[PDB]
Each structure stands twice: as structure tokens, then as C-alpha cells.
Design a protein around this nucleic acid. Structure first.
Lengths: 1322, 131
RNA sequence: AGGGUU
């Protein structure tokens, strides 16, 4: 009934249909019963409805209390849930018309609590659970928060057992007055508002009771309906999210504990079902982590180890009090030591023998259960009662100890578990046992662990995929031995394997500190492969694999079938290369080894080793480490997972000392603006802006809302210092003079040439101040110029404050260093770290910088020699940095001090007459005009000489350190003032950097919205704390959250967990104030309109507005941009020759034909790049390029043929864009992908798509409403330039109405050009 | 190599420096292992330091090192409980620990003191084995 | 992909 839902849409609510039939309630009723319910909530049906804008155009705007029904409520929730599944804005229509949302919300609550199997089915109530989960996860929306407040505030505690409430009020006496105040205010309520309030206050506690009864209805072994399982799963998901967010946790945690839900769940039949309850069990483990999380519910602070111990001690103590006073049969047990009594074992020993009635009575004295009336039997199971008391009082290991026992490699028990390692096929219909990234985290440990686990799971999934690819290729067959029918590049048969070291555990740990093994392979392979295997280096991670093949020899493998059964997968273990052995038995001027056998010494995960050994010793399990028969290596650039996890673990272990003005914002709570410079207590009043402003006019124009007062009236005297107040809109500007640097005018400093806008100035100003500076920089708004100006200003204002620069890509680093080179920054203070093709004019790597220092030292020591001789000092020996230092103090400073004593303690003539360095500067002095002038000229000469000796003193280290590595260490730890690297490198090298004693004061980042959350956090901690506090003074982040996010290989982790969300993006969402750059300078204003709607006030720079090059039309094309409709070609639109390898022959051929048309017009083929949203189409366009252009002299090649995602930060003059899709919109619905796609062109953008499909997409409307304002048929001018954008053309305009007509035209045009011309490349 | 030892004496003359010194001793530790025992006699930074001392005690078969390690753990109620657990697990001798707990369990007012005393009495109470 | 004195 796809024609049914669509026809309804067209009639009643579809977009781009002028007139619709009026609202009819029966449409909602019919669609819900016959389309949604009857199809068993089929995802494709729900998608069609959602995409057709059912919620925005029919459901909500026609919703009222009078028309509300079951079908109406459910339909709204289905649409909202689907929007979350598709990661599009879910709440906008409610925000537009908020009036009836409170009524709607209250009735969602009623429906959720409705009797099981009653009016609402269990699936329908699962849908409601998920919807409510989205609500609780969306408290940033005022409309939602105002409804949810009453469900989760202190008054919810009226759902507590009366004894537990009193216990809590006694525990926190200050709570009682607030409790009383609530009871008083309740009196002022009318009877219905009171009843509504009480129902809301009891909702979550009552929801728990509903869950518990659903859970209990699950049989142990008999068949169970999946709807019960999924309800229970979604319920625990809700519990986790409520518990992992402080505002929802604050009061609800006590409620959850009072209900004893967790004990119910661990004793349940469902967890005991190994297959059915597996996901439920994993969700349960997550919930347990949070119900016992180490945080104070009221203060929100993390609990110390002492506080934890006290909590545990106090519980035992109160249990012993009750034991002593009221238990005789167990009276002897009470007398037990608290520690002995506390272990699980001791507690079972003491309380296990007791009757159900006695245990119930014990629990009642702890306010855990109601009193058991005299002579009554308890209704609770003994195992419940026992587990209740035991679990509550047993010793717990801390969160840190728990983390420190985790292996860093995935095993075969993890790699194929799709509850925690989902495939890319994950629809989003079920939930996963995964952490979620949104806005807030409980503590730093919570924050770090969520990122740890999310990073861990994706890497494990990738490893599993790699293993499947390489192990399948090896074709493991039975021979009871294994024979490999194939070979693999990335995996080899193991010839020998031996554990060679199991070291003793460190104090406080139960695992070996180090496990090593020797693994031998036989490189009977192609020399290319032999070289790659010998290319393995220290810290490279490999996987050790055990297969016991299931198939006879010759049996075909099917990749579609379950991998584990196919090859007989038994074990997977990770390892880390220490080094390859040489023929002297040494772990590796690398040698040339002989033969084809190679042995590698590797590290095994010590925690995994202990667990396996324990399993072997205790349970007779076979020794895993005697079974490996395959070893697999990976691509180094895709194989950093283990190092990153270790770094995260180290960060968790350390005290994580981040700036106190950052901690709360990082965790996402508290005032998002509290780190803004205007709110920093150490805000600096006066700043030297140096070369930031080109003139006093530029400066005045840079501060629109301020009154500028200059300390000097003469306009000819107007670098600038600016003083900021603390009338209060007044800036005091002081012009000053750069100190003379010597008699060589070329040694005057380089200067900034960029006339920064007032907005760019606000960014630069903020970056110079202490605190958090966030800059949102739309395409081409000058992010890089802002960055280097901030860096330059910090460099000059705060010499020996060191700046750390972190980017995502090496391209951004190339751009920064390029612009840095044009500014007044000494290259000896620059350093670039990396694990690369040199793209800058100078080499800023450790290698390049060591070499510069060495070469500069030589030149400077020669200057000292020349100075020596000019002074008539004898001595033929050359100087070292050491003797140069002696020379400066003894020969130079002495002469200068004597000189200053004469002329600065007074004629113009005596400035020159007594100047001690005439001969040295003969190659270059005094003007004899005034004293002040010549004196400063003399001063500048001394500064020139002093700079020589300052550098030589810095360079002495290269005389004390011979090796290039030690020399590079000196530059990194001491000499450089600006140190740059990628976030990737920073993550890998943090351990080494901290060990070196790396220090820095300021961090600047670019591409910030492209960097993963945890890889943004790590660069904050590349150093040790200073006197107990972070040394970090500034944090500048520059990025664009309206462009593409960090890349997540498996998009299931984005769909469920929002793992792609950068820290930058989270901070913007949290509400951290941003500086939004508002004037782009790389593309036509006309093209800028296609994306500037997305940003705050994004306009254009003057040169874009005024330069001819932006108003000159594109030859042979009427419009500078067009959207071109492309219907079917030979009955096909989009095609899929391989699964998900989306293509569109009609579009591809048209694009190539246009490219050919342009080349035949004389376009620079290199100035054209071709983009598409799918890799399948990319290869197809390339295919057609080679098969149609081929060996054509008149037709070149486009600079690139690639995807939009691979063209981030890149551009060309002309972009040819293919959107490919005809059936569904696909991932272009992500507006960020849209914005990037709309902004890759400087001068020309031509898009080929099924226009109708994308027009219907609500999120894409602001772009496509502009694109469809122009014809959808390509307007060409084939006889054409100096024609301007607006002027009517002096040639014929022909309209190409389709691709075949174009391919015809281009053929005829070319056959006319082959006859009339002849070009000649060979 | 000697210089590190010289530095250790300087550390001995004197928290982070204590960490550097304890790491210097744990770097491996003969008579030095017993000396760590001196560190247990003086101070332990965290259960982990105490755990390392316990490991040294485990490493040396003779009883006194283990007794010292247990004492280090105590220095209150939690430490005493840990010592009691060690005694329960330890079958080596009842004398050293006997007196320890006696004076250690003289800071308790009630029930557990009488009950605790009874438990101690219970713990106290071929050929010899038959007798 | 890393450097030094009886």
C-alpha cells in the first residue's frame, strides 16, 4: 500500500502541493490500524510516513484534546521515534505549537502505565518506553523539561516506602524543610491539580512495578513472546539513561533502590535464558554499574575511596546494630568481625541458614521491606530476601579496579556479539548494550569510560571484519589437522608459538606485569609480502587465531554464511610486537636475515592471560596459548585502537587535573559561559595587538560598540596596545614603536596584511585572553588567518608561554605553518610532530628543526669570529657555543656597559664617537640628527648582537647532545614556543610526552568539529599538573559543527550512541558562547547563498563582492549554478550492481558529457572537480571518463573524481555534482553533508539529481528551494569569456532537456572539432 | 647505579619523593625487601603500597615479614578486619597475631567485644591431633 | 623509524 500512504499524503498533507483536503481524523485512525499496526510496525511504512512529513503537516498541528485518541498518541510517538532513528530534528513542530503538548504528554504517561495486554499491546507500550526515553534524554528542550520536571524532582519520593522516606530525611536533615515546603504548597492546590501532581510524582515508581510484573511473566524454559523480551530490554535502557544523568538520577536513584528492581532482575527467569535474555543481561550489567556508581547524589561530586569505604562500613554497622538487638538465632553471627561478615561468602554463611521470615524481618529493620506482622509468613522468596541483604552489604571493588582488570583486546566471545558489536546492517529497531554520548556525564570517570568502551567496541568490530577477510582467504580445511587451501596478504600460518615470559604481579594486582611470547612464521611468499611482514615494528598489534576447520578439503566458502562455523573459529587473542629476532637471538642498520623463517617476540595482554590461566587451572579449560595456528597483521593507520585505550586508562588512573574553570563545562553541566574571557578573574586589562590592525581606522572599525580614545592626538603617530575596562564602552588605544633590531632594515619584522573584520577581531581578542574561546568558522571565513594571528599575538605578548596546536589533518597544519612563515615568528621556535610529504617551504619536523639549528649555529659562530676580529682580539681558534658565551660577557657586555656609562649617564656626536662596534657593522649607521634617534640606533645594534648570542646559548644543547633524537627532545621540551601535531599523533604520543616533561600553556585547535570527543579531551593532558593545578591558561577551538563530523566506520555506533559527536559540537549544544565568523572570501556570493542560510549572519567579504573574478560568468553556461533534473535512462534510475554500491548511469553519463563539453570549450580541465555522494557512482564516473575520453587530446582529466565526504576542506573553481538517488534520499538528508556539498565550488556548481525526490525532504528545503528557482534543464551557450553574471548573453542559448540530447550534442561538437583542429601530446 | 642508592638515602632522610624511593626499592630487594618492611613500619601510601608489602611477605617463607605486612595494613577497624581475615587464611602460627588482636580488640565497647572475645576463645579451642 | 671519552 505504498500507493495508499502516498496518495493520502498527496491529498491531505504532502509538501509542494498548493491545496489540500481539510483535516480528517479518520485518516489518522485508518493509517494507524491498517498501515502501521497491521504491517506489524514495518519500518518502511513508518519511514514513508515520516519522510512525507506526516508529523509536521498532519498529526501535530491538528492535535487537540478533543480529537486525541490511542491511534493519535501512538502515531505521534512512532514519528518522533523514527526521527531519532534517522537522526533528524525530532521536536521542532512541538516547539512551534506548544499549547497542547502538556495534555499530550500526560496521556502518554497514562498509556505507558495502562494495564498489560489491555488497551495497549506490549509492543505499543515498548514504543512508548522508547519515546519516553527520548524525552528524558532531551531535557535541554524547555517544552519537554517543563513536563518531565514533576516526574523526577524531590516530590517523587512520595513513591518511597514510608520508612525509607523517613530514613532519608534523617540521613539528610536539611532535606526535611524542603519536604515540608512541598507538602505546604500542595495544600494551595485544587483537588484535580493535586491528583495530577501525585500521579506524576508516582509515575516512575509505578512504571517499575509494571515492569517487574512483565518480567515475572517470562517463563524459564517454555516459549516466550519476543514482545515481552523487548519490553524488558527497552525498560533497562530507560533505567540506565535515567541513572546516568544527574538531574534524573538525583532523586530517582533512591526510588530505584527502594524498589529492589536490580535484585528482581538478577534472579529473573529472563537473565537465565542464555539466548533470549543475553541482551537483557548485558543491559543489566550496565545498569548495575550506574546503580552503584561512585557519586554523591546530592552534591554531584565523585566519591573518594574513603567515602566509599565509610558508606560500606556504615551499612554493616547498622546491620550489626539490628542483629545484636533483635536476633538470637543469628545473635552469634552479629558478633562477627564486620570485615569477615561482609564478604559475599561470609554474608551467605551468616544469613543463608536463616528462615525466610527472619530475613524479611532483618530487611524490615533496615527499612528495606514493610514489617512482617506477628505470626505471618513472608510472601517473598528466600532467594530474593537473601540476595537483597547480601548484595546490599557485600564488599565491592571500585570502578578503577574494575577498569584495570579489563583486557585491551577483544576475544572471540566479543568480536561476533552483535549486541555490543553491531554490523552496519543495524536498523535501530532494537537497542544495544552501548554507552551514549549526548550533553552531560556524571563524573570524569563516567566520561572517560563511555569513550573508552565506545572506542573499544568499534575497533573490535573492525578487527573481526579483518579476521574474516584474511582467514577466509586462507581457506582452512580439514586434513584431524588443518591445511590451508589459500593464501592471504594480511595473515600467515603460525609455524611455532611459545610463551617465554610470565612475570610476577606488581603489588596490589592479581595479574602478571608482563607476558611475552615468541611466534614464528615461514615467509614462503612473494617478496612484496615478505617485505611487509618484515615491516612489522614495535607496538604493532597482531591477532593470534585458532581455527579447527569444519569442512573437508576443497569445500567452497560462502562469505554470506556464519564465519565461525565456516572456518571453525575457536579463539582470538591480541598481541603487540616487541620486535623481530635476529640470528643472534636479539630483539631488533637493520640486518639482512637469511632463510624464510621469521620469529617475533610479542606482548600478550596480562589480564587476558590471567583469566585464561585461571579458567584452565580452575575449570580444566584447555590452554588457549598452545593452540594458535594463524597470525594476522593489520594496516598500521587503522590499528591504533590498543594504544588509545591504554592512554584513556592512564588518564582515568591519573588525577586528571584539568583547569577548574573547565571541569564542569567538560562534564556538560553548570554555566556554559563561565569560561568566557569576560568572566575569567584573571582577565588581562591591557593587550599588545601588535600588527593585528593595519591602521587606526581599521582599529576603530573593529569595535563598533565602543568609544576609542587614543593616548596621542597627532594623527601621524596613530602597533597598538589596547586597554579594556572593568564610559565602560571606552577603549584606550596606545600606539607604540617596535624596538629597533639593528642597522639592517631587512631585519624589520614581517607584518600581518589581513584586514580582519570586527567579528574576526572578537575571536582574536578572546584567544589572547585566559579561558575558553570557541570560534565557529563557516566555509572560507578565514579560520586559518584568525588562528595564526592568535598564535602570533600570544607569541609576542607572552614569550615563554608555549602554545600547543592540534588539528585533525596534516593539511590544516600545512596551511597554518604556511601563514606562520609570513609573520614575525622565529622558525627556531617552531616544531611539528608526526609519525610525511613535506608541503611547506620550510621543514618544521624534528629533523628539519635539528638541521636548521645545526646550520644556524655554524653561521652564528662565524659572526662571533668576525666580531672578535673587528675588535682586534687575537685568537685563531673557532668559537663554540660555550666560548661564545664567555666572549659575550667578557668582550661584548663589558664594552657595551662602558659605552652606556659614557653616553647614557650627552651629545649626538658622542653616540657615534664612543660606539664600540663600528667595524663589525661596516657591511651594513648614525644620522647625527638627534641624540634620541642615534641612541636608539645604537641600542638596536646591541640588540642585533645580543640576539646572536641568545641563539647560540639556546643552541649549546646541540653540542651537548649528539644524536638527532636527543636534539629533537631539547627542541620539544625547551626550545620551541609553538608545537603542532594531529589529534591522532597526540593520542599515540601522550605517554612519551608526559615522560619527557612536555609543558605548554595554551592550546589552539582547528577542524575541531571533525575531531572525536575523546581525541579532543586527550590534548588537554599531554603534561603533568603544576603544584596541583593544570598549567593550561587558554583553550581555543576553531571549527564548524554545521559541516561534517568525525568519521565513524560503522554507522551503527552513530545511530545508537551518537559516537560521531565532537566535543566542539557538544559544547555548542551545551550553550558555550561562540564567535561566529560572518564573511567568507573564496566563493561567489551567489554560491554562498546555497549554504549561508545555515549560519548566523554569514555574508561576504568585500573582495568577493567587488572583484571582477567573482562576477565573470562561466563560459558556455548561462547560469553560474544549476540543479539539473535527470529522469530514467533505459528504464533505470538508481542502480546497485553490488549491494550498497549505488550508481546512476543517467546522471554519470550526463556529468561526464558536461565535463567534456567544458573541455571542448577550452576550460582548464584541472579547474574542474567531480563530486558525488556515493563511492559506487564515483567509480562509475571514473569508468566513463576512461571509456569516453580515453586517449582524447582535446579532453583532459578533472583534478579529482571523488565523494563529497572525501573533499572536506577542499575546493575547485568548478564542481560537477551527482546526487545519484532516485528511490530514497539517503545520507544527504544530513544537512551537514548538504552544506559541504554546496560549498566546494568557487565559481561554478552544477548538480545532477532526481529533483522531485530531494524537494520532498524537509531538511533540504532551504537549499533546494533556491536551486529550483532556476530551470532544471541545462542552459548552454556553445558558441562562447568576458560576459558578466547578470548581463544578457550575446550568443544563442540552447536548452538541453536530457542526458541523451547532451551526449548527442557533445559527440557532434567533438566530431566538428576533430575535423577543424588537431592537438599533439605524446 | 650507586647514585640511585645514594639518592634513596637522601629520600630516606625525608610524598612524591617517597613514591620515587619506594619505586627505587621495588624496581628489583634482598635485605631491601625486609627494608620495605621498614617502609611498612613507617608508612604506606595506599592499599597498593600495603599490597606490595604483603607480596614481599608472601615472597619470604619465614613468619615475621608476614606479621609486619599485616601490621602495615592496619595502620583502623577495616585494617583490623583485614588482619583477622589474614589470620583466618593463615595457618602458620597463632602466637604473633594472638597478642596483636587482643590489644587491637580493646577499643570496642559492646557485643562484638564479648562476642568477639568468645570467637577468639573458640578459635583458640594421631596422638597430639587426637588429643 | 632514535647520536658520543684514562
Amino acid at each position: 500500500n505504498a500507493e495508499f500512504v502516498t496518495q493520502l499524503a498527496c491529498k491531505y498533507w504532502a509538501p509542494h502541493i498548493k491545496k489540500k483536503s481539510p483535516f480528517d481524523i479518520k485518516v489518522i485512525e485508518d493509517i494507524y490500524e491498517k498501515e502501521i499496526v497491521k504491517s506489524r510496525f514495518a519500518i518502511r511504512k513508518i519511514m514513508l510516513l515520516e519522510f512525507s512529513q506526516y508529523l509536521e503537516n498532519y498529526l501535530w498541528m491538528n492535535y487537540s484534546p478533543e480529537v486525541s485518541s490511542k491511534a493519535y498518541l501512538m502515531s505521534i510517538c512512532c514519528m518522533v521515534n523514527e526521527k531519532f532513528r534517522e537522526n533528524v530534528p525530532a521536536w521542532e513542530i512541538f516547539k512551534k505549537k506548544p499549547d497542547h503538548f502538556p495534555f499530550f504528554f500526560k496521556h502518554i504517561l497514562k498509556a505507558a502505565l495502562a494495564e498489560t495486554d489491555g488497551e495497549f499491546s506490549l509492543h505499543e507500550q515498548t514504543v512508548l518506553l522508547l519515546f519516553l526515553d527520548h524525552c528524558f534524554n532531551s531535557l535541554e528542550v524547555d517544552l519537554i523539561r517543563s513536563q518531565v520536571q514533576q516526574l523526577i524532582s524531590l516530590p517523587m519520593w512520595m513513591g518511597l516506602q514510608l520508612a525509607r522516606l523517613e530514613l532519608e530525611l534523617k540521613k539528610t536533615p536539611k532535606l526535611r524543610k524542603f519536604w515540608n515546603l512541598i507538602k505546604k504548597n500542595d495544600e494551595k492546590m485544587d483537588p484535580e491539580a493535586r491528583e495530577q501532581a501525585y500521579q506524576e510524582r508516582r509515575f516512575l515508581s509505578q512504571l517499575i512495578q509494571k515492569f517487574i510484573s512483565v518480567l515475572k511473566s517470562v517463563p524459564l524454559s517454555e516459549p516466550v513472546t519476543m514482545d515481552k523480551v523487548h519490553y524488558c530490554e527497552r525498560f533497562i535502557e530507560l533505567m540506565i539513561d535515567l541513572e546516568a544523568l544527574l538531574p534524573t538520577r538525583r532523586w530517582f536513584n533512591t526510588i530505584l533502590d527502594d524498589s529492589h528492581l536490580l535484585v528482581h532482575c538478577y534472579l529473573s527467569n529472563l537473565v537465565r535464558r542464555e539466548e533470549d535474555g543475553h541482551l537483557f543481561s548485558q543491559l543489566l550489567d550496565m545498569l548495575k554499574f550506574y546503580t552503584g556508581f561512585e557519586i554523591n547524589d546530592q552534591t554531584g561530586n565523585a566519591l573518594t575511596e574513603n567515602e566509599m569505604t565509610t558508606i560500606h562500613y556504615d551499612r554493616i554497622t547498622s546491620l550489626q546494630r539490628a542483629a545484636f538487638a533483635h536476633f538470637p538465632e543469628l545473635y552469634d553471627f552479629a558478633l562477627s568481625n564486620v570485615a569477615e561478615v561482609d564478604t559475599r561468602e561470609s554474608l551467605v554463611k551468616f544469613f543463608g541458614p536463616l528462615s525466610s521470615n527472619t530475613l524479611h524481618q532483618v530487611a524490615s529493620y533496615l527499612c528495606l521491606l514493610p514489617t512482617l506482622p506477628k505470626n505471618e509468613d513472608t510472601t517473598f522468596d528466600k532467594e530474593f530476601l537473601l540476595e537483597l541483604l547480601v548484595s546490599r552489604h557485600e564488599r565491592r571493588i571500585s570502578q578503577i579496579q574494575q577498569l584495570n582488570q579489563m583486557p585491551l583486546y577483544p576475544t572471540e566471545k566479543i568480536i561476533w556479539d552483535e549486541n555490543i558489536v553491531p554490523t552496519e546492517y543495524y536498523s535501530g529497531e532494537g537497542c544495544l548494550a552501548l554507552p551514549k554520548l549526548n550533553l552531560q556525564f556524571l563524573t570524569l570517570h563516567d566520561y572517560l569510560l563511555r569513550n573508552f568502551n565506545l572506542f573499544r567496541l568499534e575497533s573490535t568490530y573492525e578487527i573481526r571484519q579483518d579476521i574474516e577477510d584474511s582467514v577466509s582467504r586462507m581457506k582452512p580445511w580439514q586434513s584431524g589437522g588443518v591445511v590451508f587451501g589459500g593464501w592471504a596478504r594480511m595473515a600467515q600460518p603460525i609455524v611455532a608459538f611459545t610463551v617465554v615470559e610470565v612475570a610476577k604481579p606488581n603489588i596490589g594486582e592479581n595479574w602478571p606485569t608482563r607476558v611475552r611470547a615468541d611466534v614464528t612464521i615461514n615467509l614462503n611468499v612473494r617478496d612484496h609480502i615478505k617485505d611487509e611482514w618484515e615491516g612489522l615494528r614495535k607496538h604493532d598489534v597482531c591477532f593470534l587465531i585458532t581455527v579447527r576447520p569444519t569442512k573437508p578439503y576443497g569445500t567452497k566458502f560462502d562469505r554470506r554464511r556464519p564465519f565461525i562455523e565456516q572456518v571453525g573459529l575457536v579463539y582470538v587473542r591480541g598481541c603487540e610486537i616487541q620486535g623481530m629476532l635476529d640470528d643472534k637471538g636479539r630483539v631488533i642498520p637493520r640486518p639482512n636475515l637469511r632463510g624464510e623463517s621469521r620469529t617475533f617476540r610479542v606482548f600478550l595482554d596480562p589480564n587476558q592471560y590471567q583469566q585464561d590461566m585461571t579458567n584452565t587451572i580452575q575449570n580444566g579449560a584447555e590452554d588457549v596459548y598452545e593452540t594458535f595456528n594463524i597470525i594476522m597483521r593489520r594496516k598500521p593507520k587503522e590499528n591504533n585502537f590498543k594504544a588509545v585505550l591504554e592512554t584513556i586508562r592512564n588518564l582515568m588512573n591519573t588525577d586528571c587535573v584539568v583547569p577548574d574553570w573547565l571541569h564542569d563545562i567538560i562534564l556538560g553541566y553548570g554555566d556554559p559561559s563561565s569560561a568566557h574571557y569576560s568572566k575569567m578573574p584573571n582577565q588581562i586589562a591591557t593587550l599588545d595587538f601588535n600588527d593585528t590592525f593595519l591602521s587606526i581606522e581599521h582599529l576603530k572599525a573593529s569595535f563598533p560598540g565602543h568609544n576609542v580614545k587614543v593616548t596621542v592626538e597627532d594623527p601621524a603617530l596613530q602597533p597598538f596596545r589596547i586597554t579594556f575596562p572593568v564610559e565602560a564602552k571606552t577603549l584606550i588605544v596606545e600606539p607604540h614603536v617596535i624596538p629597533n633590531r639593528g642597522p639592517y632594515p631587512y631585519n624589520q619584522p614581517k607584518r600581518n596584511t589581513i584586514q580582519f573584520t570586527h567579528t574576526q577581531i572578537e575571536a582574536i581578542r578572546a584567544g589572547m585572553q585566559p579561558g575558553l574561546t570557541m570560534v565557529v568558522g563557516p566555509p572560507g571565513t578565514g579560520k586559518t588567518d584568525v588562528a595564526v594571528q592568535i598564535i602570533s599575538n600570544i607569541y609576542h605578548n607572552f614569550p615563554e608561554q608555549r602554545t600547543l596546536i592540534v588539528t585533525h589533518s596534516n593539511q590544516a597544519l600545512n596551511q597554518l605553518f604556511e601563514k606562520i612563515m609570513a609573520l614575525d615568528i622565529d622558525e627556531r621556535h617552531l616544531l611539528r610532530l608526526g609519525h610525511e610529504e613535506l608541503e611547506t617551504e620550510k621543514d618544521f619536523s624534528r629533523y628539519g628543526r635539528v638541521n636548521y639549528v645545526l646550520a644556524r649555529r655554524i653561521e652564528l659562530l662565524e659572526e662571533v669570529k668576525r666580531l672578535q676580529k673587528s675588535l682586534g682580539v687575537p685568537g685563531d681558534a673557532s668559537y663554540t657555543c660555550e666560548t661564545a658565551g664567555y666572549f659575550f660577557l667578557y668582550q661584548v657586555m663589558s664594552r657595551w656597559e662602558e659605552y652606556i656609562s659614557k653616553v647614557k649617564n650627552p651629545d649626538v656626536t658622542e653616540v657615534s664617537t664612543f660606539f664600540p662596534f663600528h667595524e663589525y657593522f661596516a657591511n651594513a649607521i648614525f644620522k647625527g640628527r638627534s641624540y634620541e634617534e642615534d641612541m636608539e640606533i645604537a641600542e638596536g645594534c646591541f640588540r642585533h648582537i645580543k640576539k646572536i648570542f641568545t641563539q647560540l646559548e639556546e643552541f649549546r644543547a646541540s653540542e651537548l647532545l649528539r644524536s638527532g633524537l636527543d636534539r629533537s627532545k631539547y627542541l620539544l621540551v625547551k626550545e620551541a614556543k609553538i608545537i603542532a601535531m594531529t589529534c591522532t599523533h597526540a593520542a599515540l604520543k601522550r605517554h612519551d610526552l608526559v615522560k619527557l616533561g612536555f609543558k605548554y600553556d595554551n592550546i589552539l585547535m582547528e577542524e575541531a568539529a571533525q575531531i572525536l570527543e575523546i581525541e579532543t579531551f586527550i590534548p588537554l593532558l599531554l603534561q603533568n599538573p603544576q603544584d596541583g593545578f593544570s598549567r593550561l591558561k587558554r583553550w581555543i577551538m576553531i571549527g564548524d559543527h554545521h559541516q561534517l563530523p568525525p568519521v565513524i566506520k560503522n554507522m551503527a555506533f552513530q545511530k545508537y550512541s551518537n559516537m560521531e559527536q565532537s566535543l566542539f559540537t557538544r559544547f555548542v549544544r551545551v550553550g558555550v558562547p561562540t564567535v561566529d565568523l560572518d564573511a567568507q572570501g573564496r566563493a561567489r556570493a551567489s554560491l554562498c547563498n546555497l549554504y549561508n542560510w545555515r549560519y548566523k549572519n554569514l555574508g561576504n567579504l568585500p573582495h568577493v563582492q567587488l572583484l571582477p573574478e567573482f562576477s565573470t560568468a562561466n563560459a558556455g553556461l548561462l547560469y553560474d549554478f544549476q540543479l539539473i533534473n535527470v529522469e530514467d535512462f533505459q528504464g533505470v534510475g538508481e542502480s546497485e550492481p553490488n549491494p550498497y554500491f549505488y550508481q546512476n548511469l543517467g546522471e554519470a553519463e550526463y556529468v561526464v558529457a558536461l565535463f567534456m563539453y567544458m573541455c571542448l570549450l577550452g576550460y582548464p580541465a584541472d579547474k574542474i572537480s567531480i563530486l558525488t555522494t556515493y563511492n559506487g557512482q564515483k567509480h562509475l564516473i571514473r569508468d566513463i571518463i576512461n571509456r569516453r575520453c580515453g586517449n582524447n587530446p582535446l579532453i583532459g582529466r578533472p583534478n579529482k573524481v571523488t565523494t563529497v565526504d572525501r573533499f572536506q576542506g577542499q575546493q575547485n573553481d568548478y564542481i560537477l555534482l551527482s546526487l545519484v538517488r532516485t528511490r530514497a534520499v539517503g545520507h544527504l538528508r544530513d544537512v551537514r553533508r548538504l552544506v559541504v556539498a554546496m560549498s566546494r565550488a568557487r565559481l561554478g556548481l552544477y548538480i545532477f539529481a532526481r529533483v522531485s525526490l530531494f524537494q520532498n525532504c524537509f531538511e533540504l528545503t532551504p537549499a533546494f528551494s533556491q536551486l529550483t528557482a532556476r530551470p532544471l534543464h541545462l542552459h548552454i551557450i556553445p558558441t562562447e569569456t568576458t560576459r558578466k553574471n547578470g548581463e544578457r548573453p550575446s550568443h544563442e542559448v540552447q536548452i538541453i532537456k536530457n542526458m541523451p540530447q547532451m551526449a548527442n550534442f557533445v559527440y557532434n561538437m567533438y566530431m566538428h572539432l576533430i575535423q577543424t583542429t588537431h592537438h599533439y601530446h605524446q | 647505579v650507586m647514585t640511585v642508592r645514594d639518592f634513596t638515602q637522601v629520600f630516606d632522610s625525608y610524598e612524591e619523593s617517597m613514591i620515587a624511593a619506594k619505586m627505587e626499592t621495588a624496581s628489583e630487594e634482598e635485605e631491601d625487601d625486609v627494608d620495605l618492611e621498614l617502609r611498612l613500619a613507617r608508612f604506606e601510601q595506599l592499599i597498593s603500597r600495603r599490597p606490595l608489602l604483603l607480596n614481599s611477605v608472601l615472597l619470604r617463607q619465614n613468619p615475621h615479614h608476614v606479621h609486619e605486612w599485616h601490621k602495615r595494613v592496619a595502620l583502623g577497624r577495616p585494617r583490623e578486619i583485614i588482619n583477622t581475615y589474614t589470620e583466618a587464611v593463615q595457618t602458620v602460627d597463632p602466637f604473633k597475631a594472638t597478642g596483636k588482636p587482643h590489644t587491637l580488640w580493646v577499643a570496642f565497647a559492646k557485643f562484638y567485644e564479648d562476642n568477639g572475645q568468645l570467637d577468639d576463645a573458640r578459635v583458640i579451642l594421631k596422638v597430639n591431633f587426637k588429643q
